[PDB]
Amino acid sequence: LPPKLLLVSFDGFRADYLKNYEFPHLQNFIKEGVLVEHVKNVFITKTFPNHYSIVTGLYEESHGIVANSMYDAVTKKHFSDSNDKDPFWWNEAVPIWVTNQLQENRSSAAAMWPGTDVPIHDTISSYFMNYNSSVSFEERLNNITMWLNNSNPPVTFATLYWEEPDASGHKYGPEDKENMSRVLKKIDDLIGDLVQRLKMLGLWENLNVIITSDHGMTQCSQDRLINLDSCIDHSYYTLIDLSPVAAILPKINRTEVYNKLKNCSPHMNVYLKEDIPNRFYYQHNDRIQPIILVADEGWTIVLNESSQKLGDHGYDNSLPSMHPFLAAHGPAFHKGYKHSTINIVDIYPMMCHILGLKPHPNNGTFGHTKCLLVDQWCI
Numbered sequence: 001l002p003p004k005l006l007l008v009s010f011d012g013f014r015a016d017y018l019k020n021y022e023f024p025h026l027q028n029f030i031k032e033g034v035l036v037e038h039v040k041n042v043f044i045t046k047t048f049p050n051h052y053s054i055v056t057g058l059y060e061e062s063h064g065i066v067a068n069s070m071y072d073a074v075t076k077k078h079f080s081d082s083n084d085k086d087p088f089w090w091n092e093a094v095p096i097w098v099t100n101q102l103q104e105n106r107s108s109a110a111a112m113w114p115g116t117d118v119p120i121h122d123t124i125s126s127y128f129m130n131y132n133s134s135v136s137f138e139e140r141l142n143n144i145t146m147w148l149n150n151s152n153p154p155v156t157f158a159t160l161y162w163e164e165p166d167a168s169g170h171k172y173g174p175e176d177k178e179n180m181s182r183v184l185k186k187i188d189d190l191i192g193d194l195v196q197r198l199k200m201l202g203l204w205e206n207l208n209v210i211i212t213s214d215h216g217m218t219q220c221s222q223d224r225l226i227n228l229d230s231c232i233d234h235s236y237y238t239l240i241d242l243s244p245v246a247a248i249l250p251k252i253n254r255t256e257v258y259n260k261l262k263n264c265s266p267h268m269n270v271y272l273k274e275d276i277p278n279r280f281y282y283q284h285n286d287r288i289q290p291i292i293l294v295a296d297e298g299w300t301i302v303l304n305e306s307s308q309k310l311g312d313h314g315y316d317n318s319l320p321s322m323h324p325f326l327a328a329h330g331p332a333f334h335k336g337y338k339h340s341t342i343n344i345v346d347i348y349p350m351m352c353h354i355l356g357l358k359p360h361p362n363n364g365t366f367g368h369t370k371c372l373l374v375d376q377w378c379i
């Protein structure tokens with residue numbers, strides 16, 4: 001019987017939510033398993049780029065999903081979260097569900113995880129759901145766990161995705177404790193539903209489960225706005241992505257666009273593509289535009305009519321507010337161990353190890369995850 005792994009993401013689960021709200025079900029999951037208190041994720045700290053990093057072990061410049069909205073000038077193709085089904089956009093890397101699927105006598109399964117409804121290098125998971133945000137968590141849970149438990153050839157890798165607490169974190173902002181506590185209580189209940197379901201099917205003792213997320217959330221404010229329309233005319237550039245990392249494609253002399261934008265607000269950094277800080281690993285890809293604007297934490301780049309959004313993410317990946325957490329339980333994981341931090345790109349080599357897959361070249365460090373694993377030396 002080959003090892004099995006369920007990877008679960010609750011979108012937008014800021015690491016310090018664990019310290020500020022009560023998660024009885026998640027804490028029960030943790031006490032018989034492992035917790036990484038905060039994971040250093042990848043810039044830019046958006047949903048599609050970070051989910052792909054988890055399943056590839058790659059920085060965004062390397063796997064090619066550099067934002068939730070992209071434009072490739074050469075092919076003229078556009079990407080958005082809904083318009084995300086052209087394999088072109090995913091083919092710069094090979095995600096773990098593909099490597100798993102290519103093994104004889106093994107299958108992959110998916111319930112709503114970004115990209116899992118797209119054939120990547122001509123490979124699609126045996127079981128997958130076409131993205132549909134209306135599908136309940138119960139349906140996602142029941143189908144994913146039934147697939148893991150039944151199925152032949154056996155399902156050895158599975159993904160499970162949920163849109164909260166990201167959606168409501170944007171709505172209320174993470175500083176709204178009254179409303180966020182209700183949001184997060186529901187997430188904790190869903191975690192309880194996951195555990196109860198695993199136990200009922202007798203998967204709980206033998207399935208490896210990772211519960212994690214893609215990024216956190218920080219508070220935005222009408223006192224912290226940078227209006228591009230106040231700084232530069234529309235006719236000078238095309239806006240590929242807006243806030244808090246604006247992707248700017250100049251229509252005229254780049255130097256002219258740069259000179260206006262660099263004198264717009266002290267609350268953002270304005271970079272020529274070739275000046276983007278090395279620490280971001282966000283330069284070496286044609287999908288990165290000639291100029292990017294990076295707003296300081298809690299600042300929002302707007303146009304004249306841009307809607308209010310009390311919470312946001314996308315900021316510098318060194319900010320604690322942007323970091324998710326990771327927890328895990330199962331035969332491969334220690335019981336009751338807690339660790340400060342790992343990098344989000346380390347999850348991939350760890351998962352390949354648990355599953356006995358050959359990892360593709362990546363940016364992760366397996367060593368960072370050894371203390372989580374029963375078969376490994378913990379220095």
Ligand SMILES: *[C@@H]1O[C@H](CO)[C@@H](O[C@@H]2O[C@H](CO)[C@@H](O)[C@H](O)[C@H]2NC(C)=O)[C@H](O)[C@H]1NC(C)=O
Binds near residue numbers: 058059062281361363
């Ligand atoms: C992250 O890992 C990737 C994968 O090995 C590295 O990308 C490779 O880099 C070399 C030279 O830069 C190329 O020959 C390969 O074709 C690249 N592969 C891919 C998939 O891009 C990348 O350099 C690593 N990043 C860092 C910062 O170390």
Ligand SMILES: *[C@@H]1O[C@H](CO)[C@@H](O)[C@H](O)[C@H]1NC(C)=O
Binds near residue numbers: 132133134135136
């Ligand atoms: C999305 O899911 C809901 C719930 O299953 C369903 O009623 C609806 O028809 C789905 N939409 C599409 C376009 O499949």
Ligand SMILES: *[C@@H]1O[C@H](CO)[C@@H](O)[C@H](O)[C@H]1NC(C)=O
Binds near residue numbers: 128129135139143
């Ligand atoms: C959930 O499983 C049922 C039963 O196998 C299936 O008919 C249904 O389409 C699944 N829901 C999806 C794929 O969203």
Ligand SMILES: [Zn+2]
Binds near residue numbers: 046047166
């Ligand atoms: Zn997200």
Ligand SMILES: [Zn+2]
Binds near residue numbers: 012047166167170
């Ligand atoms: Zn979001």
